[PDB]
Nucleic acid binder design. Structure first.
Lengths: 5, 5
DNA sequence: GAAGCTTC
DNA sequence: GAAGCTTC
């Protein structure tokens, strides 16, 4: 994902 | 990333 | 270098 | 299952 989430 | 980008 | 989820 | 970048 993101980086992060 | 995303999904997608 | 661990650290990943959901496109399509 | 190919398909990934940038945190920290």
């Amino acid at each position: 994902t993101x980086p992060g989430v």
